[PDB]
Amino acid sequence: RSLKAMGEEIWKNKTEKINTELFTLTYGSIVAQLCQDYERDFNKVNDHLYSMGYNIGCRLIEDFLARTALPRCENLVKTSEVLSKCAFKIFLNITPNITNWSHNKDTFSLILDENPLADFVELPMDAMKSLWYSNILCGVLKGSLEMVQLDCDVWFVSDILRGDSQTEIKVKLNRILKDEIPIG
Amino acid sequence: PFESSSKSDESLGSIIIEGTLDKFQLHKYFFIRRLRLLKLEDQTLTAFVGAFQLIKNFIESISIEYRKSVRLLEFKHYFITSMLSYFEFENVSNPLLCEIKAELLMLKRDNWVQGVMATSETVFQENFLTLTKEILSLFNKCEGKRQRIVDILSIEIGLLYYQGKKYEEAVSLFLSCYEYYTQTNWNSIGLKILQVFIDSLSHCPKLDVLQIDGESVSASAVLTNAFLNILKLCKDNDSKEIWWKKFMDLQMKVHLARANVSAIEVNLKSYGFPEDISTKTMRLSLKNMGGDVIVFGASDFLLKKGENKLILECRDIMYGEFSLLSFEIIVEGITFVKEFPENQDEFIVVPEIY
Amino acid sequence: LRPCFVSLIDESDKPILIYVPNEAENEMNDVLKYNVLSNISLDYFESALVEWHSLDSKPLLKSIFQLEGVSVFAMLIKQTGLKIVIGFEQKSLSGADDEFEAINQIFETVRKIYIRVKCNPLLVSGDEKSIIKSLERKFDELFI
Amino acid sequence: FENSLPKVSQSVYQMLLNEMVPLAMGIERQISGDIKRLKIEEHHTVDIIRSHNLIHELYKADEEEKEKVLARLRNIGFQIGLKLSELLIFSNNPNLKFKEMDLLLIMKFICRDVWKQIFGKQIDNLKTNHRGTFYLLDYDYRPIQSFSLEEDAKNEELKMIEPFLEIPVGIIRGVLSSLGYSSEEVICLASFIDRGVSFHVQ
């Protein structure tokens, strides 16, 4: 009944496979491709990762809505509820936590505990200060939320791989999309 | 009968070991169980060597049992328990596996004797160790395999030759073996072998070089010292490379061709100057403190070669030296067709063609 | 229970890494007396005195020799052709049989950190220095 | 035997596997060496294409550029194949030692375990010419069930499916070169017999 109960409930009728030894090294191999093809550029790789993320998030939102039938969200309470309590539950077997909203509650942050996209990577010295790793997630959280009629913008703040501070993602409502009704 | 004897001997040894007391007299019971195992394995081609392993692990376990300095004398008793077991393994004329078993037994006996002798005939110790190491080296060389232990044994014999003052140095004369342990895969054995070869060349006082080929040279020490400077640790031992380069400069013997991997030079954009275009300024890094050379970076056209950009004087003593490299006599009226075929050789009485 | 040297040998004659604990002080530590045992250890794989039988799927452990008061143990993991050698002295050894399983724990927990280091995606293919540096910081994490 | 160790969804991996191909087309057609879209970032702009238009750009691709694409697909399959084989090493399969003298004994490894790990099922049939040429078969290749053919235009649909086959080419090439060398290895079609793709190796 609750959004915890549904997100845990889909794990009794979801086809599953191993989270190490596949799906970590897929992302690692494509980021190795982007690193070796741009001659170790550290910011264009974020752009191409965010592009491929936007495309996979726009293609993934339909499977999320068909897997559990839910009404269209409207604020950053229901999105902050639905994300952290079923979406990463049924796609990554994890659950992040929500903190650091503003006074008008027009933002929040997305502190993640066990990111399964980067398990024992330890990025080298030059990439440690000018590269973000998990930009496929920021692309997904742009492209998924842009198709439920909300413009959005989702950005990393810090992550464990280069920094002592945790893995978190900042996010702004950036207005609500207007559905276009008439003929003209 | 044999498998039942092995399983029952292991079970009876564990059952006798279940009783805690009288561990010192239990050595005799373990020796009786070992004799019972040895009587069952009286006729085995390779498994007797495994029975020697049944000795050796027990020879490990007895080494686990006695724990004293004076028990080293009991290890001398184990030397007797080697030597009589050598008497248990001497019943062959010549064989492949028995030679390796005798080599392992002689290596264990030599290690026990070297452990005993080093606790406190000093001239005769080197002769007896050289005799035992020569016997073990001949036994290991009498095989279809095992060149790796033979090379380390020959290096140990040459170090024992160097343990007294000797002008005849087998390891230094075996620069092929030095390159076999230095060219690739080993950077601490080679750094001692090259130090021994350089010390033997320092105490050589001769100009009669190696007769195994045409390499008669007094700069063979510098040829080895280039590899010793390349395989050096850091600039803490840079005085050795500086002294070897000073000896190569004093004893010059000028023909050489080095790969110049100890120096790193990077180029920049082509430019022009007054009355001759001083193109291709380049920055160079080096390990040696002092170096002066007429370094010229060649460049190949479609059917020609400039071979320009040389500087006669070089007082630069730092990484990214930023040489000007003035390039007189521009070929093809300074055309743009010339590609890179850079020798970048910095001859400092010996060519280093990178 | 702590080792005196570790060694990883690939399918050629090369060593991937010869790491000793405590390089920071000299303390009468000779890297030379460790590499000679590592050089003869790759010889004594082919010796008929020991053999790694392949009927069990699990890779097994052996005791090839003992020189200079130091006992060494091989781990010729069968499939990828990696040869591993860890060395211990008699004073660390207790001579018991319960320690053998803990030795096998040490062997598999350095094989795990090797396969985790060489499966880093961001390192360039080829024998870099960064695989050696990452291996030694993970080993110094394991061994103070 | 039944190991229940941590896991994620199959679907997000299968669709990431599917969008590795327009990732390769996007990384080649945009190498940044000097209709599309545009997006808004903070003092920053990206410009993208969508996937099916990029597969249609593969339909209008240059011939030498097409094989310049297909080296990258077998390169990325090669990387994930050698690393995935290296993790299989932990499984301690007892079949093989090194250099694969008995080549079909590790063909009995890949069909039993590797295709089970990537695609949830065994390879259903393998036929053996004894010159090293081995004949794979599976009735339903798993990441092309979701690729819908269009209405009565299957001659385009074959040409737009089969550049997704270079990833398992990379898989089996990477698990062979994790065990020592490189030899020739190609694709097939093999129209199935009862209601997908075949592979050749040396």
CATH code (residue A86): 3.30.1380.20
A25, A36, A124: residue with CB nearest C119 = A25
* Per-residue tokens: B256: 């050489």
Residues ≥6 apart with Cβ < 8 Å to C132 = C16, C17
Q: In this complex, is the C-beta atom of A128 within 8 Å of any C-beta atom belonging to chain C?
A: no
- The whole-angstrom separation of Cα A88 and Cα A95 is 6
Cβ distance of A25 and C121 shorter than 8 Å: yes
Q: In this complex, is the C-beta atom of D179 within 8 Å of any C-beta atom belonging to chain C?
A: yes
- The whole-angstrom separation of Cα D15 and Cα D17 is 5
Tell me the residues of C at the B interface, defined by beta carbons under 8 Å apart. 12-15, 18, 31-32, 35-36, 39-40, 42-44, 46-50, 63, 65-69, 71, 90, 93-95
Residue recorded with tokens 């004797």 = B113
Q: In this complex, is the C-beta atom of D156 within 8 Å of any C-beta atom belonging to chain C?
A: no
Q: In this complex, is the C-beta atom of D177 within 8 Å of any C-beta atom belonging to chain C?
A: no
Q: Do chains A and B touch (3 or more CB pairs under 8 A)?
A: no
Q: Is the dihedral of CA D83, D89, D95, D97 positive or negative?
A: positive
* Per-residue tokens: B325: 């490299």
Other C-beta atoms closer than 10 Å to the C-beta of C128 total: 11
Cβ distance of A123 and C122 shorter than 8 Å: yes
- At B214, is the secondary structure helix, strand, or coil? coil
Structural domain containing residue A6: 1-184
List residues bridging with B295 in a β-sheet. Answer: B311
CB pairs under 8 A between B and C: 66
Q: In this complex, is the C-beta atom of A123 within 8 Å of any C-beta atom belonging to chain C?
A: yes
A132, A118 contact by CB (below 8 A): no
Q: In this complex, is the C-beta atom of B189 within 8 Å of any C-beta atom belonging to chain C?
A: yes
- The whole-angstrom separation of Cα C40 and Cα B145 is 12
Residue recorded with tokens 């980021």 = A31
C55, C58, C115: residue with CB nearest D89 = C115
Helix boundaries (H) for chain D:
10-18, 20-29, 51-59, 63-88, 103-109, 115-119, 154-161, 166-177
Q: What is the CATH number of domain C5-142?
A: 3.30.450.70
Residue recorded with tokens 């170090």 = B159
Tell me the residues of C at the D interface, defined by beta carbons under 8 Å apart. 11, 54-59, 77-81, 115, 118-119, 121
- Total tally of structural domains belonging to chain A: 1
Residues ≥6 apart with Cβ < 8 Å to C17 = C6, C7, C8, C132, C135, C136
Distance in Å from the first CA to the final CA of chain A: 42
- The whole-angstrom separation of Cα A176 and Cα D128 is 62
- Which DSSP letter does residue D164 get? G
CB-side neighbour CA atoms (13 Å) of C76: 18
| D180-189 burial: b if 16+ Cβ within 10 Å, else e | eeeeebeeee
Nearest CA in chain C to A128: C122
Could you give the angle at the alpha carbon of C18 between the alpha carbons of C14 and C19, nearest 5°? 160
Other C-beta atoms closer than 10 Å to the C-beta of A99 total: 11
Resolution, Å (one decimal): 4.7
Q: Which residues of C touch D87 (CB under 8 A)?
A: 115, 119
- The whole-angstrom separation of Cα D79 and Cα D73 is 10
Could you give the angle at the alpha carbon of B175 between the alpha carbons of B171 and B181, nearest 5°? 80
Nearest one of B131, B118, B103, B4 to B69, comparing CA atoms: B118
Chain centroid to CA D131: how far?
A: 25
Nearest CA in chain A to C118: A121
Q: Which residues of B touch C71 (CB under 8 A)?
A: 60
- The whole-angstrom separation of Cα D168 and Cα D81 is 8
CB pairs under 8 A between A and D: 110
Nearest one of C114, C57, A21 to D82, comparing CA atoms: A21
For chain C, which residues make up each domain, given as ranges?
5-142
CB-side neighbour CA atoms (13 Å) of A173: 17
Cβ distance of A25 and C123 shorter than 8 Å: no
B281, B292 contact by CB (below 8 A): no
